[PDB]
Design a protein around this ligand. Structure first.
Ligand SMILES: Nc1ncnc2c1ncn2[C@@H]1O[C@H](COP(=O)(O)OP(=O)(O)O)[C@@H](O)[C@H]1O
Ligand code: ALF
Length: 310
């Protein structure tokens, strides 16, 4: 007995998907799904590494990694895009360390940015809940899961396992509104909420800095590598690398060439980087430079790789 198995299995998956959701069972090869709702990340690589071409709306994402790696950047980038399309964002601050200049440089209309700075972890998630429940916000981001210390541990009365309780609680309740409003919550994790977020979260991102981007002088950026460890929206375990310039953020340009060569649209005749005959430049950075100053052609590449995938 051979094929009827594949038909019994097709039903199996249908059965499951029915009671546990679209992404309850997947094949790592499935090119499946693709909505109209997606916040680009800033890098075409991470975009397609998400499969869905951006972040998924009405869902909670968790981006975790080591101090100084990419996260917040990625986040603020997700903030800057969910902004460029007239949506509005809130930044629930718990570390007190956002640098507006850098945000502005990435593109956050810092002025419209709903920022808040709670004095207890609990209060922190709630502000996020009602802010969410209004259906006004498109993207909301809670900076750091680890800094959300409980009122109790804050009042002095220290048991423990306060965090994992408060989180789960909030997450359970908070997971509902989200899918019912279309706001995507982004949680910066560090490295403790663990379990809770781990499961409610529909997309988990592992960000870590790979190499300290050498550029003649000292250092222009970092070549980050995000590893989407969980993806209830598209075949997980996919990943992406990209440069993050010091002060400039993710080089959408730098992403374009790399993808451009890994997809045949850009040819690298040894040192030179070609595109549809026209010579781009000599040296990834010289081409990055060329693209940024030549946006018209820049989104041309970005356009032609989209057609060939998402
Ligand atoms: N104001 C800034 N000027 C230059 N580079 C910055 C600045 N803020 C962040 N970065 C870059 O981002 C890296 C850390 O990213 P950031 O968003 O602060 O945090 P994370 O990536 O950990 O979420 C730094 O190593 C640096 O490359
Ligand atoms: F540089 Al970070 F979390 F902002 F490690």
């Amino acid at each position: 007995q051979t094929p009827d198995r594949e038909k019994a299995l097709e039903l199996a998956v249908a059965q499951i998907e029915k009671s546990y959701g679209k992404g309850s069972v997947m094949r790592l090869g499935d090119e499946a799904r693709q909505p109209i709702s997606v916040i680009p990340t800033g890098s075409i690589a991470l975009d397609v590494a998400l499969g869905i071409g951006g972040l998924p709306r009405g869902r909670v994402i968790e981006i975790y990694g080591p101090e100084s790696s990419g996260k917040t950047t990625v986040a603020l980038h997700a903030v800057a895009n969910a902004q460029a399309a007239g949506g509005v964002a809130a930044f629930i601050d718990a570390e007190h360390a956002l640098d507006p200049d850098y945000a502005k440089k990435l593109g956050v209309d810092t002025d419209s940015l709903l920022v808040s700075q709670p004095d207890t972890g609990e209060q922190a998630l709630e502000i996020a809940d009602m802010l969410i429940r209004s259906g006004a916000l498109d993207i909301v981001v809670i900076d750091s899961v680890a800094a959300l210390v409980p009122r109790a541990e804050l009042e002095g009365e220290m048991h423990v396992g306060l965090q994992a309780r408060l989180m789960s609680q909030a997450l359970r309740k908070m997971t509902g509104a989200l899918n019912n409003s279309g706001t995507t919550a982004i949680f910066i994790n560090q490295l403790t909420g663990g379990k809770a977020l781990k499961f409610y979260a529909s997309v988990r991102m592992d960000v870590r800095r790979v190499e300290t981007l050498k550029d003649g002088t000292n250092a222009v950026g970092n070549r980050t590598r995000v590893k989407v460890v969980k993806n209830k929206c598209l075949a997980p375990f996919k990943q992406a690398e990209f440069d993050i310039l010091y002060g400039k953020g993710i080089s959408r340009e730098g992403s374009l060439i790399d993808m451009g060569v890994d997809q045949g649209l850009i040819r690298k005749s040894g040192a030179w980087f070609t595109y549809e005959g026209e010579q781009l430049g000599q040296g990834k950075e010289n081409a990055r430079n060329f693209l940024v100053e030549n946006a018209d052609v820049a989104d041309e590449i970005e356009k032609k790789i989209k057609e060939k995938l998402g």
